């Protein structure tokens with residue numbers, strides 16, 4: 346691992362740690378978790394999502410190479426990546442012992458909790474299978490952080506005006522992850538491929554998420570403004 | 578070095594490819610011809626019909642191919658259907674890319690026929706699907722894949738355990754793995770100095786998932802313009 350690779354990785358891990366501290370040390374400002382409570386558990390979920398979106402935008406801004414893309418490309422990359430980063434983070438926050446997703450102490454969510462928020466079967470089960478598959482890979486914080494950076498610099502997102510530049514920005518992160526995994530687990534050649542394959546799954550999960558949003562609109566459950574900008 | 582089994586798995590796929598591609602040359606003159614000689618909506622419809630007809634041929638070759646991949650026919654039939662339903666357009670996009678010619682900026686299909694970006698537009702498709710297809714083909718060309726690499730990628734694509742409605746995803750993952758390992762060892766040998774080729778190949782699987790969605794948006798949009806899929810395509814993609 347070169348000096349520049351160490352600096353890039355260390356910067357990503359420190360930014361991930363600062364973003365978590367900034368966004369999820371204090372109690373989140375959310376509708377208290379209780380027709381009456383169907384709208385309220387949904388709102389709750391929606392306010393959590395907004396807090397994660399904010400965290401993700403904060404993190405993206407600190408990824409070397411991002412804030413130097415053209416502004417429209419920044420927006421286009423974040424628009425597509427957001428739900429996928431959320432799925433990764435949800436997998437990070439997953440606890441196989443309890444089968445729940447922990448944001449901080451006293452804020453955890455199970456498959457049942459998701460159903461009560463109005464969410465379909467078609468969205469919940471993939472989320473939870475993907476989370477437990479992520480755990481069997483046993484990614485550490487550097488691996489997650491690098492995977493997020495790679496995810497952001499995907500040159501095939503809709504409305505990207507400079508795909509050549511995005512792809513060149515992705516390469517160093519791919520190279521760092523390749524090196525990192527070679528050093529960590531030298532006798533585990535499929536670890537790295539297995540990680541990239543989860544990026545595939547994340548594209549599908551994004552579509553399945555969009556279907557949840559469209560389905561929610563059918564129960565007069567609209568996304569609030571900060572999420573509407575991104576998803577409907 | 579590739580083991581005997583890896584060499585045979587590749588040779589098997591590459592030769593199934595060929596026996597399946599026999600339907601392409603024999604159905605070529607049966608197809609609704611591309612219309613020559615047209616003013617500005619007759620010809621629009623004939624071009625589209627032409628496109629649906631080649632897609633049908635492709636659907637059938639992909640079905641025939643998959644039945645030859647070892648272990649496929651031992652999957653539960655509902656799972657066979659679910660993998661093909663999802664993989665079909667993605668394999669077609671791989672085949673489209675494989676046939677892209679950068680000199681003419683045209684795609685070959687079924688041996689002799691070729692299509693430009695503007696031919697796709699003339700057949701009623703929209704820029705939101707067409708541009709990504711051609712960028713993907715250009716990107717695929719820069720990787721310089723050979724017949725073995727494409728065949729391995731298609732097998733990897735078929736055996737994607739995370740398709741919708743798959744009932745035994747673990748049985749699918751178990752079939753995929755040796756193909757992934759074969760591709761890793763293949764690229765390592767072919768290009769020992771290019772460590773990023775293999776990751777870039779895997780990332781083409783990511784792009785294929787998005788293109789699949791864009792294709793669904795294209796089919797939706799085509800119905801607005803009197804262009805509904807025929808029965809065999811309807812059941813896979815509507």
Ligand SMILES: OC(c1ccc(NCC(F)(F)F)cc1)(C(F)(F)F)C(F)(F)F
Pocket residue numbers: 387390391394428431432435464468472554557558561568572
């Ligand atoms: O967009 C929603 C959403 C729910 C959960 C998440 N995060 C959980 C996970 F796993 F999807 F990432 C993100 C968005 C919402 F509205 F709740 F925020 C959805 F319910 F409509 F799908």
Ligand SMILES: OC(c1ccc(NCC(F)(F)F)cc1)(C(F)(F)F)C(F)(F)F
Pocket residue numbers: 625628629632666669670671673702710792795796799806810814
């Ligand atoms: O589904 C269609 C289709 C068109 C071209 C292809 N193959 C070209 C490529 F690049 F997508 F693979 C496949 C399906 C159709 F209808 F022509 F078959 C679409 F036009 F509606 F999209």
